[model samples]
Target chain A: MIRNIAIIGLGTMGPGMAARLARGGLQVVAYDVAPAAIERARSMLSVAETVLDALGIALPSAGVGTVRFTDDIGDAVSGADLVIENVPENISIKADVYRTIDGLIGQDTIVASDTSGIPITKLQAHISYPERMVGMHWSNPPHIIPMIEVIAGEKTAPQTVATIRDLIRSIGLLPVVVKKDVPGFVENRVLYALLREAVDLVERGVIDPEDLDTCVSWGIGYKIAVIGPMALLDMAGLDIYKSVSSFLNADLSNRDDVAPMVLEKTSASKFGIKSGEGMFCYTPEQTKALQAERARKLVAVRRILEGRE
Target chain B: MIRNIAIIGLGTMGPGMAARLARGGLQVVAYDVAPAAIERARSMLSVAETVLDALGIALPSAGVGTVRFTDDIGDAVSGADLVIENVPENISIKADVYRTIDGLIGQDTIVASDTSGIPITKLQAHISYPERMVGMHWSNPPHIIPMIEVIAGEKTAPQTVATIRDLIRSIGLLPVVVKKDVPGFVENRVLYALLREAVDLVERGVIDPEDLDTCVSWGIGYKIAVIGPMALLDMAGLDIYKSVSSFLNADLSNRDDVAPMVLEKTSASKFGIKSGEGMFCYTPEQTKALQAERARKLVAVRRILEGRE
Candidate 1:
């Protein structure tokens, strides 16, 4: 169980995740298609290394200068025990990458797609070792966000599930094993439903955008920070829910496509922090502060939840 | 206008809430069907008054001494602008209570039922002033838990929603408005879904009860204490969810509800606390301690959520 992990497509999420893995004492070989991204990953690891060095922790000898940096997709994953694909969301490209890794990597190697949208079974169709393929849907800015949804495909082996679960835990992140790989998985299914409604509410002029966010921030947003969707169900009896759902609740009557308002806003380049403007405007310094604070709070709260002194 | 509130059905939820309103500087005319319950409420208020008196905050005139206990519902609500019904979850019983209040209470007097499940419109069908009836579902042991789900029905007046929202803030509980009253409203729907799954997981053999709770406790439960469901949705990104849903992951399909193995040792009746023997064995003191801890953590987290120093 020496988890020598190879990270493909060293981008925003993958690089940060690699740093976290290396920090957890795992040897990580990180690679990207673009030379610039490989350089960026190297720079990211240096910053991570400096943080570890300041904490008086020894940097692993393997991933320091020894970490693999290659444009050859096959070479990046060769001989690695764990391969995490963090390429862009285009399924065609990721499928090709998975196919390449299938030929290059060991059959037992645990390959997880960091694709937030595509189903794992769908992603595994082109791969030789389908049982080894599963979905590792990380929250954006994965280096900082501890929440990772481990989605098991219809044909995913339980051992694969356990491997990813344990791997996530080893990295000191909270990995939620989604028993089934249903639409959106556990976290996003709930997330998108709310967002769809939030956009719908906005389109309908139910409340101002500021007020809407405030309602969620103060109300529903605050609740999930504690128990999440399922746990909240226990406290509220089912009998009560039926009465309410019968009323104002609407089935994704229009789930065929994104709501117009949401499409307009997101398509117009509100890619959140990475794009610089979304719901709230933030400067680079502000974005950095927000991202860092988010990381600190996510970690701090997890620690607090454990009742650590 | 000074808000005079009446606390009705002085059971576990009522008397403590009466104390909070009194402490928050509202003139409380509290009542219960049982004289002993009224005396208990009065005793609690006196103790609270003594503590406040020691801190040099003048007690809200110790109207506790004048709190009248009677079978007369009208007497309790005489001059009250708001009547909070904290009774058990019997539909017929609640409808009757609403009917009684409508006849006696003022036209503008808002009647907020503490029923977590029943929609206000359905419950107020017997009453002419159905517009005044709304669901103010308080978390159990409302005296301690700062969370309240304010649910509005089809005909619940906007003023009623606005007033109750203000009233919840006035009394120091964090109010999350359930704009569309879906089954279980907001928190309960999510909580019960998890609980049912947790129970069903035990009913089935996917994981043991302790292990299930532990997974959630260490995983999402810790987060739920802070952000709540809606905010986590924002961070998770909705688009990623659209992908998960299309896949239909395994957890939903593996649920015990689908031909689960029934175990003699795992019946819900034998399932710990409710059966007096759940996953964790609880003594009388331990049970009380658990309740108290839930209250304290909820309140503390509410403060953090409100960004209170």
Candidate 2:
């Protein structure tokens, strides 16, 4: 019965999420305190809807529900069945959002956070209806990518997990139910693991950066985009995996600390696309072009990957 | 410079390599000892040619080359400028191949192995013309995959590496150099690191197996297929990666041993698709279907990925 859903802190994810939920036939109220953010989000909402339509995400047969924008927090959540926090990643800012919304939403209103870094357990700690809070980590460019990770905090009820998981499925999207509330969850855990080795290899001069990218995108990434890691084990054979890992695992990167390449860059305040320099130097033009290029490619591939599923 | 080529061992990779080489205007002699294996390769060559043609890999300006089959190893390598050994994954079997071809071919003829496990340095042992021996690993379905890994052993000359590297590029393919003759090279090393963590999470019950696949394919795979890891570091700010790695890397799997899930399966002789059970249960029909489905999806996605590059 997730009918009226309130979207709080409309930054990158909120507008797209609102468009998706509305398309799923749920009434959505999108909120943000900043006037500029609200306006950008309002326009981005239309952009997201257009992209979703282009991806052929259809409206529910009953009819599509409306998406409205509001600035008032009380108006956004007091009457809603779900309130999604799409604020910044810091715990203090997110906790503050929770403190404000905890007093307004109903006891049974399901609360979800879109934080990629913080654990859902820590976020759900002070809530009176803690069992209703869960982690719904959506991939970047959320509406385009069709999968969402559903994580249950320590206090989260199994019912909350089920409801969220089913809702994701009901909307014609993939829901990956993560049983443990691990940091980075399953997606980032796997991604970081891949990244750690990638950096180590580049750092050690085993392969150049561009060549590494080409190898990954054309070699392993080409296969992985179609067949996943577990399925790939079966495809490659467990005996081969057993034999390969016996020697290969020890040869791989096992450093718990950050790679010096990243450390030196961050130390120099080259935070990447935002700062225009990191692993590969990027001009502002290049940054915008790459982001748009990647997003366009992601949407196209999403259609292909979803078609198979 | 690689005009006449001999493809020894016409199993999985030989036929495709022949088709791709022929398309690149190089004369290829595909050889196999088993009578049935030669017949099987004859049909697979047609299949690969059809696939390569469908992918619109343009033929060389001089015109498309020709593929011929031989029952005799000496006949295959006698006039060849390069001999590619796509034999079984044992050093004894491969070393025997080198011994057979050595006396027959010119001293300048390049001998490249398709072995993924054995290091080029070890394979180069006892060869009089060791400088001409290198590792040229092609991903499965060698015709369709445009990337190849070129590795140099201690005795492998710089000219050998460059010639092989350029020959790969001379055709319409990508060549990634692995500087050190390390186990697994770059692609498999990066892939195993990812798989180890993925299995660790599943074994600990942090996520379900199916959910894990979905998480990877849709969430991380979707992005990574377009942006490689080093570029991804730039896309995701270095500071954010630094921050995440500080805590998340410690929590990730640093185990040097194989996952028990795979070890147990191999111990029972369930070597995956060949045996129909490893991580996922599959019938013989299902294995065939999955492989075909994977090839279909991979070909489509490869075109899309190459479109951007």
Candidate 3:
């Protein structure tokens, strides 16, 4: 039922997703605080159009005219039946944005936060009708990836979850309904747990980070590609894990250790996309190369899943 | 200089490793408690010989005949410079084996335990020269995966650690020296953490276990095949993760409700390898197909690393 939608933030993840939704015949009105961002987004949309045209996946009949740019948050949400917010990660900023958009949009208008980790409950605390707010956890550069975790916060009505789930499905994305407000939802939480320990292992001097990564890629990481960590564990057996967890929980449990290295890395501005050096030593060109490779492989994986012969 | 090596516990992991070592043109004496195991191991040696013959890897006349099978524990360890023990998980059995082997083997003979979880110090406690005892943590089906973790125990000598590191490299496997004595070592510990969470998620009614596996496989598993988890994290930058982790740890802090469910799935009795149903709902044919695929993938991954352009 969400035919026309307003995207409140047009940062990196937003533009691609907005374009994808537009391509799926959903009218997309994208709004951003910065004009330059809107300009960049316009260029990206044109590129998307070119790609779609090449692939013969008819660009929406509404045409590139389907998208509109505005600075006023209220103007963006006024006519839209659904509002998708892809703002930066400050919880206060998100709550304020949601509160404003809730007032401007229709009473039944659905508001979806594209925030990765901040629970929607906390993000939309100031909003009047919080039930309309839900977390649509999309993978980064969302257009390329199909997974959309339809996360329902505490008190988020089942109908809202259903609404977003259907909307996501209509756009050809796989919407995994998350009943509860999982900490990092599905993907980020599972990923960070592994990342935290990988950092700790390096900090503890158990092994150099480089070699530790080598163990994973050549060793277990290969298996993980075809299967996930959970399935792999299921293969490894439950009892074996309990035995190990009994030890980790009792001895190595450190909540503080979760982001100990994050502060260290970020204080030095290793923001990956910006600073260009993260866990892997990447030059600026390497970053682009890696990202390009990721896009290609992601497309390949999708094709494989779609049973493309 | 680890010339003459005795591989005890000629079971699944040990014999394949022994055959790989023997095929690497090293003198290897393999022994096991069960006669049937020894018979199976001899067949593996013949298979390895055929593989090497096909590959045109030259075999030294003395070294080709260096790998001898024996039931007598004393005969296996008599003049061997190193002993690699790959036994079952029982502490009592490991202690007993180490005690007997320590007495029969020479003082300078380096002792390495091919244990997945149990600490080397615990097993070596039964032996007189505990300094000689260390860890050689090999991946499951070690021959196919050329990555080995060389872990030093509390009483383990620095030189002993260095020697094993050299030996592991000489045999064409990457050796990661574990500086600390963390139980389950590196890969297994991180893997189990993932396993525990996976079970916890399933028990908490988050999603179907099969779906969980599918999610991870599609999401991060592909990247992991190319790079390790830390490297991937590095690619994503640490700050975003730090932000995500802070929220997740606070939320998942109280997991008392999820523990029993985790324990239920991982119960040792229902352990898949022994009980025949752990993670995948595998038919016997499915199990073979799955395991064969894993072995093939593992071997191919190794080949890719060797610059197989």
Candidate 4:
């Protein structure tokens, strides 16, 4: 039974996870280098009850578990059964954090990195017990989205994976293991391939960004949300799939170079909603509306998935 | 107004579309060479009320539209405002149907092919009024899924495209216009790329077929179903996406050749659900269960989307 969990780096991902872990009745101690980060997290935890009340869901009898926030890494790591580091995506920063965390946490504590694309094998090299180091990739707003990729490093022990998977399950998250240590793992690999094609289509003037997205959101996205591509092919008839692939694969974008449109947009600092423009334009008001609408839609979709709607 | 629509060559796509068009209150005349195909379509038209009853929806007062089934192409196309060709995916067969359809239909009538991968421009070459010919790619069980890709060939008229889009919308289907004539149009290009990557991963032993599908069905599928991928990148932060793309794209499967495993499987006649096996085993009972489950899930998802559930 993993009781105590330490969340290193109280940034974007950390606070949501800390809140969720607390709600799941796990003792969460979170650490950040900045004092303001700790204050922000504590405030979120305090407001969670009011938010639940406002949403009309009565607080459970157990209520929420206790969460302690601090700037001291040593205090956060002590007496923790798990240490989850969610620092910047930079390898050097992650390496330094893993090194520090490896020394601070008890030998029994499993260390996991919340890196999106980094291979766990490389991150494991920074720690003493490589077998205990794993990749626990969490989606944004962890309390809402239920999926997590529990990735294992080359030398990671099976017991470490089991503990991490069990811990994730305990926190009300669906954990899908990345059995191999491939780059981008499964999700990003498939997603980027799709995005790459989307970029190519946009650059070639075959479609507008809005229409491209609509094709997915309205069509393929609806189907895929329940069933994946492979199973879709199975139901769609693999012979038909094979025949299509024979010709379509030859015509698909196979360019090794980065998509010109992506490069151009990034260079222009069109960082999407944050910058008000990327593929499509978004004003501050529009961005705010988009975010809220997306959250609402996702919540509704989640309810449907859970058969609770 | 495309009041009289003819669906030629009733195969897999034609019957479902015919039923939907009829239900949408359009006069639908469907044709096929096989007597059984016409019989099956006629039977569906008769039982559409029962199906709607089973689905817990009231049969509309308009009921199924006046449907005339014939084996003669000339008879089917005559006096039709729109002719949707759903012939087999063979250029020779499609070419013959297009030639016949072009001659038989009125000059003002729009002709659309339901070819999934074939470029509309190539199909237009066989017709006299190329401007009137477009690609109206429909998803399987068209009455259920509400998405159709209205692809414009190089010679396709703007007015013709507008009419088709409006007509599709009239039937309560979502029509995403493909401005350019590209192989696979929008959906298949992205979908085939996903399938290619899926095949590559399965072949590489990076993940089990079931596990790989689970990752998508649970993770990205759930998210993308609500939002398109580009919008997702915007929400996730584009700079981070750029950075990940820089490295991840390089490592992703860029193989131009057909995935050996898919070819091997297809050659072995392991054509999935139809063949009782493909990536994962599927007995007839299992296939039936899979179909029912998918239909049920999609119906549930659609209800959630429409805010009815």
Candidate 5:
């Protein structure tokens, strides 16, 4: 059984991961080079704990695990059963970190990457212990969302995957293994597909962004939350799918490039909540309000899905 | 203002629309050419009433309106303020129905379609009074799903669109107006995008259908239910989306044809819950179980979404 874990690079996802892993009774050593980031992570972790308490996720009966902050890489990596790399999303940076930690831990110790969609196979090429490297992509606000994707790269061993799956389940999280290492994996591929078409509709002046959001949140997106896409074919009926898709597929967005709407926003520095606007405008108050509301509703949705409600 | 409403055909969607409209205090004459269809609609309408009752959608203080079944087209359309055609999805069939109902009603009477995604512009072409024709696309389980797409054809007058929008609001439902008469409109366009990529992932063996469903239903699907796609960009940070989509969009599925897996299933007559199988297997027992579970869970989810929870 996996116990000791180290989270390298305490970014947006790391603090939450550390907080959750500790809540699940695993010791977590959270490391970040930047002093500011380390401080922010500590603050974030405290807030995450409160969110978990609100979610009613109490400490494990075995007693809560420990989480420690560190700036020294060696202190973070030594004696850890798993070292999860959560550095910035650059192959060069990620690979360098992998090679750096490869020597710090035992050859059998798992070295996981939290890269959202980068192929673990590519990252494996940078390390000597390629067999242990895997992708454990966690959704945002990692403490509350219960599902985690366990992806095995080309060089990763099956045992590594099994251990990761076990770890996820032991923590009361759902592990949906992605059998193949494809770009964007499954969750993002499906989501981007939805977003691509959403932009197409808004850009083409078919509907406003607000209206589109309502249509999805209330209409299809609401159904998808319960039935899923594959079962939806059964629910909508395959013959009807064939009939609708026969014409509608050609009518869908088929662009291989980033949507113009988003591209324009990116260049304008409208980088979502970070900026005042992205696709939609957001004041600081509104952003925090929306963020709070989204988190609250997501927790509510998670409990409903968990059948705990 | 749209009190006297005619449901031109009683298909899967008609009963729910008729029930909801009547519940909102409107006179509804539900018509269907086939006796069997009319009979089934009665049973379906009864269930819909119970579902609405469970939803706690009470009758207006003015009192619930009436729903009458009729085979005569003239009887249904005569003196009606709006005629909602719920025919099968075929342009020719829909055009014919519009033509048949045109002379039976006043030219000033609003003509609306309950088609899943067909362009209102195309349907308006068949009727002489095109200015009165608009698209009033409602989501399935129409009584529970609060959002409706109010689409305006090229020839449809602004007043015609406004009247339909007003009527949708009168029933305590949401009306997301489609300013452009695009094919598939917005909701289906977004949904089809999700399915195409979903099939792509399954076909390539990046993930199994079951795993994919788990990922979506629990992963992003959970989030999208409350925080829509555009807002998701703001939530996820558009900078990250830009970075990811810049490279990943090229890797995403851009097929303009139906997926091979779904095609094979269709030809094999595995037409989903209607048949024995689609992408997933289902015996009649399983189908009935799943259908019941889906409807029940959907009701629970709707109440949560409606903020009544």
Candidate 6:
């Protein structure tokens, strides 16, 4: 029943989702404060030619929905059935956006935030109709990836979750619901647990960074793609896992603090491709090459994941 | 210069590796005390067409090397350039094999064990020429997957490590080096760290088992297949990782004890495919279907990984 959607904050992730939702046959109104962001979203979401083709999701000649870009937040949320906010990670910035959308949207309209790490319970406290607010967290390059974390807050209505879940399915994406409102949610908790060990290994000089990564690319990473860690544990036998975990957990990195390597890297402002240097140096050409290679692999992986081939 | 290779113990992993080594143009000497195991291994490693075909690695008719089966341990280790032990996981059983092979093999011949969790240093201490002993661990159905963890023990010679690495590459598999001797090596350490939290989540009832696996298959699991954990951290910006790790790591499961769910399931004799049920119900027909599906997907993934498609 939800046909009209409003996407606030046309940043790196917003434009991609806006274009994809429009292609999925929903009327989309995209808003941005910066003129440059609006211009980029307008060009990327054009009906005649779009960036979605490069990502392997095609639109028909006729049935594709429309997208409109505007600088005014009021114009974007006027008649929207659902509003998704994606701003910076700072609490103050997100609170301001939530407050504005709280006053502008209809009472029945569902409001969701595409936050990376913030808890939905905390974000909902800032809005008027707390029961209507939930977290619709998407991975980077939301148009291509097929997973979305549909998180429900403490006071979130059950009806709101069902509607958002159906809407995500309509757009051809898998929704994994996080029933409990926990910090970092399910995805980031699993991810950061792995990252802590990876950083600790490098810090202790146990393995080279490149070698540690290769161990994943060829071994654990490849198998986990087809099987989940739990199912893999089941397939591998619980007895073997129990024995390994008993000893491994005792030796694993249990420091209550973050690894100094990450602190040092971030302190220097050597933040990956945006800057020239990170763990390894990346020239402008190399960064583009990496991005292109990643896109190609994502497209190939999507085929297998969706069972298209 | 290493042409003659001997595989000791024809268990689940042994036969597959023996066939693969034979197909790689090395004369194979396979030994086992059980006559049934020897029969099964001989039938599979034969020059005639075999079960290896279903595994998706084909052997050219002319280039296939010879394999001889024997019951005597001394006969298997004599005149072998390299000997790989794939015995049971018990320390005492492995110690017996190491001591027997240590006395029979030549000084220059490399002695490697396929121990999953035992430290290479401890295993080497039981052998005569400790400097020649190393750990070459491969996952299940080794012929299909193309990764081997080449680990060096405390007293292992550098030249021996290089020789084994080049030899692994000669068999068309990628060798990831683990320089220092650590329990579980590099691969399982990273894997168990993630598994610790995965088990905790299931124990807490935060998410369903099937849904939890889906998040990994479509989210972190898929991305890590294309990029390693370290490079992914670099791409996602270290500053964000730092912030999330600061809060998430503290909240993550750092328990030094094993989860009771694993022990309870294992105590009930619910070991995966071998048993009828573990985590999920699986009849004989369903287990076979799952195996077939896994093999098909592995073959497809290998093609993309090797850039052959």
Top model number, TM-score: 2
Candidate 1: tens digits of C-alpha lDDT, residues A1-309: 536778888877766677667777777777787888888887876665554443333444453323556777666676788888899888999977887777787888888888866788788887886888888877645554566777788778999888888977755567777775655555544443444455555555544455455445444444444443323333332333333333323322224455555455466765445556555455889767755554445455544444443
Q: What tens digits encode model 4's per-residue C-alpha lDDT throughout B1-309?
A: 688889987766777677778767788888998898888776666554444444444324663466778888777888899999898988889998877777677888899999987789899999888999999989876766777889988899999889999988876677889888888899888877777787788788877788788777666777877778788778766777788888888877876666888888889998877778887788788777867667666766776565553
Which segments of model 6 are wrong by more than 4 Å?
A: A42-64, B42-68
Q: Each model's fnat? A: 0.04, 0.83, 0.51, 0.64, 0.80, 0.65
lDDT of 6 by residue, B75-114 (tens): 8878999999888898899899887787788888898989
Instruction: Write the number of the candidate with greater lDDT, choosing between 1 and 2.
Output: 2
Residue pairs whose backbone atoms clash in candidate 5: none
Ranking by TM-score: 2, 5, 6, 4, 3, 1
DockQ of each: 0.14, 0.80, 0.37, 0.61, 0.75, 0.68
Off by over 4 Å in 1: A35-79, A99-108, A128-137, A140-160, A168-185, A190-293, B35-75, B99-107, B123-134, B140-160, B170-272, B277-293
Q: Per-residue lDDT of A236-285 in model 4, one digit per residue for the tens?
A: 87788877887788888876656777788889998887888877788888
Question: What's the TM-score of chain A alone for every prediction?
Answer: 0.82, 0.95, 0.84, 0.91, 0.96, 0.93
Native-referenced Cα lDDT, model 4: 0.78
> Higher-lDDT candidate among 1 and 5?
5
Taken over the whole model, the C-alpha lDDT of each candidate is 0.60, 0.87, 0.71, 0.78, 0.86, 0.80
For candidate 1, the docking band is: incorrect
Residue-level lDDT tens digits of model 3 in B1-309: 578889889776866677778766778887899999899888876655654443344445555435788998888888888899888878888887888887787888898988877877777677877898999988866666667898888999999999999977765668888888887788775665555555567667886767676556655555566657776776666776766676676554323222676556555455564456775565778777877555545454444444442
Which candidate has the highest lDDT of all?
Answer: 2
Highest DockQ scorer: 2
Worst 10 residues of 1 chain A by lDDT: A245-254
Model 4 complex DockQ against the native: 0.61
**Docking outcome class, model 5:** medium
Residue-level lDDT tens digits of model 6 in A114-189? 9978889899999888898999988877876678888899989988888898988876678888888887778878
| Model 3: docking quality category | acceptable
Instruction: State each model's C-alpha RMSD to the native.
Output: 6.1, 1.7, 4.9, 3.2, 1.9, 2.8
For model 3, which pairs clash?
Answer: A238-B266, A239-B266, A279-B234
